[PDB]
Design a protein around this ligand. Structure first.
Ligand code: CL
Length: 263
């Protein structure tokens, strides 16, 4: 029942497998603007993280999903049930770290990882600029508790970054679709994560796609991933502002993604 519960979709006529995994606050509809342009060369697998509002919250086990490993378990169980033994994986935001952890568990499963808006750690640490202090994320948690709508209206336009009203509308919609207690629980999981230690164990090639101005990911984080991932790594700067460029600048994302995929 995992395929139905996480709204797994297999679409396209291509011969290679492309997996699209979204970040916190949205669902697989975040890929709607770029999805048509990869169905020729790839058979695309999409799914919703267990925390998405489009997933019945009866599936969210707070004990189980206290760790990102449970999200990795879901991803691997989906690919196993689909009999997928090799794929290229695009992970947006937290799904990028989910892909890295999954590649460590299954080194032969992932041919290439494409990290979109990826960060191993959002909290600052000395010269490591993650972009946030504990006071920052504590203010986020406090805002979600006192008034969830007030937090959404502050997070959605700043996450989109650029003045693209259609992208703000879409990201606001999926954020308001999320249950407030789940949003608070999962934000704590992502905001307080630190995967810097396991980056060296990732051996598959990684393509890092970073926007020129991301409120959630400083530029130095993209170069940190480049230097510490244990395999072949390349960094490309999307010439746009925002943390969800597949919504706010799809044409540029399609161009860059086609290059990284040889399509
Ligand atoms: Cl995220």
């Amino acid at each position: 029942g995992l395929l139905e519960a996480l709204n797994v979709r297999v679409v396209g006529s291509g011969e290679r497998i492309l997996v699209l995994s979204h970040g916190f606050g949205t669902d697989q509809s975040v890929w709607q603007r770029i999805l048509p342009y990869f169905l020729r060369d790839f058979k695309v697998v999409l799914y919703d993280l267990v925390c998405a509002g489009s997933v019945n919250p009866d599936n969210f086990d707070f004990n189980r999903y206290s760790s990102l490993d449970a999200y990795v378990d879901d991803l691997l169980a989906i690919l196993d049930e689909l009999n997928i033994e090799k794929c290229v994986y695009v992970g947006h935001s937290v799904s990028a770290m989910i892909g890295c952890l999954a590649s460590i568990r299954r080194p032969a499963l992932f041919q290439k990882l494409i990290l979109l808006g990826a960060s191993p750690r959002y909290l600052n640490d000395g010269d490591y600029e993650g972009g946030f202090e504990q006071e920052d994320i504590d203010q986020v948690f406090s805002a979600m508790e006192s008034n969830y709508a007030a937090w959404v209206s502050g997070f959605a336009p700043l996450a989109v970054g650029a003045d693209v009203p259609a992208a703000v509308r879409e990201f606001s919609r999926t954020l308001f679709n999320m249950r407030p207690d789940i949003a608070l629980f999962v934000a704590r999981t992502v905001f307080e994560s630190d995967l810097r230690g396991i980056l060296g164990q990732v051996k598959v090639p990684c393509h890092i796609i970073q926007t020129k101005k991301d409120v959630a990911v400083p530029l130095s984080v993209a170069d940190y991933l480049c230097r510490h991932l244990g395999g072949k790594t390349t960094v490309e700067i999307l010439q746009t502002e925002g943390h969800l460029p597949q919504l706010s600048a799809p044409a540029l994302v399609i161009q860059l993604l086609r290059r990284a995929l040889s399509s």
